[PDB]
Symmetry: C5
Subunit: 206 residues, 5 copies
């Protein structure tokens, strides 16, 4: 309708696109995971496949509007191609991430943005011992590929992974799943990089 | 020809694209399934592969026209890129959906749209006992990913899935299948979300009953 | 060369694209198949894989020209993305069709268009018995996905599938292969739909 | 830098794109193969997988220039999307060809173009006997899909396939590899079609 | 924000895009590898699968700017499609390379560009004997596909591959990993081509 069409036009067609965060105007991205299934374990390559969805949240000044000038609209759905999105990357993936959900985000009038992509990820993980009582632990770090802590900081609202949608007839049951902010120093690069460490302990269901 | 070119120019070139539904102007989408084949079952990963086509139907005021002004055209075929389509998503898929049919919809002069994508889906299903007489039951929810019940509502014209085109020499025979509207509350989000729940009961092709 | 550049400019840049057939201006598409190979049979999923090319031919008034006004040019090759092409679809496929030839068509001065895509198709077929003398029969319907018989009719020039290019060292030999126009109704839709039914009888090579 | 930006602007941004060859102005494409590996043999489906690169060469008047008018530039690299390229197709492929090299060509001042795509190809081949001393022979034709011999002719500079880059630890050794022009008639079509027939004899190492 | 939007507009919207290096304006690209995992070995096809990231660095005058004129910005992140990038190719790949990281580079005020793509590569490698204590050695050359040594030269900062992110529970342990500039003369082409040779010696853990 007319009001939403005006708002989208005023936000996206007038200005050039947001060029991303800088040292003077840094950005904090909130991350959270909802784990749906450990689909597959490969003991001959030490790869494990997860299905999850990842809640991403950030805020920009350039996406603010006054609701009363646009028919009391407080939020709207928009294609993720119309906006900047953070370059969050699994640091130990072995295949390109597969997208399982529409590339659509929600923008709120205060400038906040929320994007919740469902994904299937293959990553490095040794499953030896998964058929035992103690189970096995594996971890994967999620963070910006190209932005140091001076441009992108991360945090979580909770260190507990949401397990309320976990597939009840999975081959594997979860013993614990946590999501924790940490600071990393890489050999390539003298600046600190932030990531959220997803740590999942699991075993064969029996 | 001339009259259709004129109609498509007037609908798509003059105005900006429809920005999707809102709370003030919500939308109801009708869904229905025609199940063609259960292609395979993976008992080591609890994945099942379905081939089906999915009838989607909705109505917009912005796609209305008077047929008298356009050579009595009452409908037309158009690329699904030319129009908004609902973001209907399987909630327990394990692979991206594969598209098996041309991305083309039919628009009618009252503003109603019909779009019938044929798809192959891998989703989460435990096939233990599929080789029994009783068979196994599995389910997958289809609904909007991003829109709550305040912007998108769903319904079916019937709760009976169409099985009249099911592949007769499939490895799996279908005993029954239903498609039912339901309301969901996810822990991420306070608003109700609407889905259609596809339930399929099946077993390895034998037989008895 | 100057004449062809003029012709293509006059046909494609002076007008909007052809919007496809209608009830008032319907179209007949001629189909024929040339079967190259039955590559693979999967008896665990009842899928079979063919390689073939599919001659498509139709005629539009909007693609006519006088050869004497364009240096006696009687036909030309053009990208299939520059023209409308029919949405011919296999009705029992189990995977997206794979394209094995360049997406180029030939337009003739009478307005006729010929497009001959080579394809690999996986489709529903029970191969049980293929290792016997009687072999096995399988079938797949090809037709428009969205256009009824009132907008697109189909026909064939012959009911015999061309086997003159069939791979002589294939695992499978062809006993017969036919292509036949059919009409039927679907529950979705009030009008009849036209298809061409590809019926192939084959057995393991002896 | 400035002289190359001028030359490219003058060749591509002025005139419309080359519309391909015609009966009045036909084109000869030179083909040659460099075989890197026979990677895979599937005896259950009679498919074989090659990795190779394929030298394609042709010449157009609309790509000519005088070096002296452009800072002594005698050739340049450009995206293969910026130009027309020939629709050379394997006639017995069973999968889409996989592209293993960047889509960049080299244009020279006489109007000649050279494009050398690296490719992995699955094609129809019965490998029964590959484990013997005699080995097995397999063949695949490369030619235009849509142009007859009246618009596109083919040739080779040599009948021998270049084997100097063949992988020394491949499962298969090459006994011979030739590339030969031939004329073909298909039942679809009354005109002759030209192809280069790649014939490779090989056995297990 | 305002200053970065001005700078990007001034670098990418004012001028035509860089047309790549020439003989009069050659370019040197620095390469370095960080090996993360030997994921897979296929002893029936002699293919091996590596996961790594590859640091690429080069420098262009046309990407230079004065920080004082742009709010003291010394560098910025930009999409790799907005800039020219070198066509670095693995010369013995058997499949298209898979991209595992965002296609974003960092440009610095002196005109230097750094791009560090994460990749998965299948390449030709005989793994027979990987289950022994001696292990096996494999090599793959990385260089420009279309530019000779007269337009693109390569170098490394160090001969030693970075193994500090190597997956500790990999099926395979690394015995050595080096990256070495070499000069190649191919039978197709009479000019020298530069590559960096990645040599990895490994065995089952
Ligand atoms: N300040 C700079 O000039 C700069 C900063 C960062 C990079 C950069 C770093 C990286 C690495 C940091 C972490 C660890 C591996 C990968 N992600 C990737 N891509 C990049 F472009 C390049 C140049
Ligand atoms: N009111 C808001 O600001 C809002 C509303 C909806 C979302 C949103 C929700 C979702 C979730 C709802 C259901 C359950 C999981 C996924 N599908 C996905 N993507 C989204 F953008 C984000 C923000
Ligand atoms: N008259 C209309 O409003 C109309 C007509 C046709 C369609 C339509 C039909 C179909 C079905 C007909 C055949 C059988 C399955 C699929 N192909 C697919 N896609 C479509 F858009 C939709 C609406
Ligand atoms: N003269 C014409 O009107 C004409 C000429 C050629 C074609 C054509 C031929 C072909 C076949 C010839 C060879 C054998 C299989 C495939 N390549 C493919 N695609 C085409 F468009 C169509 C129409
Ligand atoms: N000067 C020229 O006319 C020229 C120069 C280079 C090429 C060229 C070379 C190559 C080869 C060099 C290395 C060895 C195999 C492949 N990569 C690939 N693609 C190309 F376009 C073509 C023409
Ligand atoms: C928006 O809010 C105002 C203030 O409460 C109200 O009067 C008005 O009816 C609302 N709706 C529109 C469409 O303006
Ligand atoms: C081109 O080559 C000539 C002859 O060697 C040389 O004298 C001249 O300086 C060159 N011109 C340019 C513009 O580089
Ligand atoms: O004539 C036709 O082609 C028709 O009516 O479909």
């Amino acid at each position: 309708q007319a009001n939403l069409m005006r708002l989208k036009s005023d936000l996206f067609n007038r200005s050039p696109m947001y060029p991303g965060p800088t040292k003077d105007d840094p950005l904090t991205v909130t991350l959270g995971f909802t784990l749906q299934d450990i689909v597959k374990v490969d003991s001959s390559t030490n790869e494990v496949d997860l299905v999850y969805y990842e809640q991403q949240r950030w805020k920009l000044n350039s996406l603010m509007w006054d609701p009363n000038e646009y028919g009391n609209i407080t939020d709207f759905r928009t294609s993720a191609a119309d906006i900047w999105t953070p370059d969050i990357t699994a640091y130990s993936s072995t295949r390109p991430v597969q997208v399982l959900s529409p590339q659509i985000a929600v923008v709120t009038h205060d400038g906040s943005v929320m994007f919740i992509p469902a994904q299937r990820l293959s990553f490095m993980c040794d499953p030896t011992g998964v058929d035992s009582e103690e189970g096995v632990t594996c971890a994967v770090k999620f963070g910006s590929w190209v932005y140091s802590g001076f441009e992108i900081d991360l945090k979580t609202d909770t260190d507990q992974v949401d397990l309320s949608s976990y597939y009840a007839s999975s081959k594997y049951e979860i013993l614990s799943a946590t999501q924790t902010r940490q600071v990393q120093h890489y050999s390539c690069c003298p600046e600190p990089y932030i990531d959220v460490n997803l740590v999942v302990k699991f075993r064969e269901r029996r």
